[PDB]
């Protein structure tokens, strides 16, 4: 009705240069472990390959890390998470030649450097506790 789909399922093809910019609001928020979680897949489907997940803990931390042939890899974390309940955030993941570097309104939180070209990400999914207003792919 007022917001999209989540889990929400976008095709993309990205380049350098890219911006992944996604609107959203933090909802649930009294519940214990609210989330959002945000996929890079190599494919269509959700077996499919993860290039980079980024996965919030609000309140609390993100994780980060890939997904191949359903085995993960390294995993990456940060506890700057700089969301604020019930407000609307800009999500922006910048794709560098090196790395996706994430920035919440407008500030860098992390950069996850690629193990795979970022063209071979063919969907971004985004999902859990979030009312989500708009996904946009630019440059």
């Given at each position: 009705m007022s917001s999209l789909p989540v889990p929400y399922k976008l095709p993309v093809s990205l380049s350098v240069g890219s911006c992944v910019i996604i609107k959203g609001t933090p909802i649930?928020?009294?519940?214990?472990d609210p989330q959002l979680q945000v996929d890079f897949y190599?494919?269509?489907?959700?077996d499919s390959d993860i290039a980079f997940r980024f996965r919030v803990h609000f309140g609390n931390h993100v994780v980060m890390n890939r997904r191949e042939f359903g085995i993960w890899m390294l995993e990456e974390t940060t506890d700057y998470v700089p969301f604020e309940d019930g407000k609307q955030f800009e999500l922006c993941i910048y794709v560098h030649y090196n790395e996706y570097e994430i920035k919440v309104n407008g500030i860098r939180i992390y950069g996850f450097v690629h193990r795979?070209?970022?063209?071979?990400?063919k969907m971004v999914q985004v999902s859990r506790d979030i009312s989500l207003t708009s996904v946009s792919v630019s440059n």
């Open positions: 649930h928020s009294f519940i214990n190599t494919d269509m489907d959700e795979i070209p970022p063209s071979f990400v």
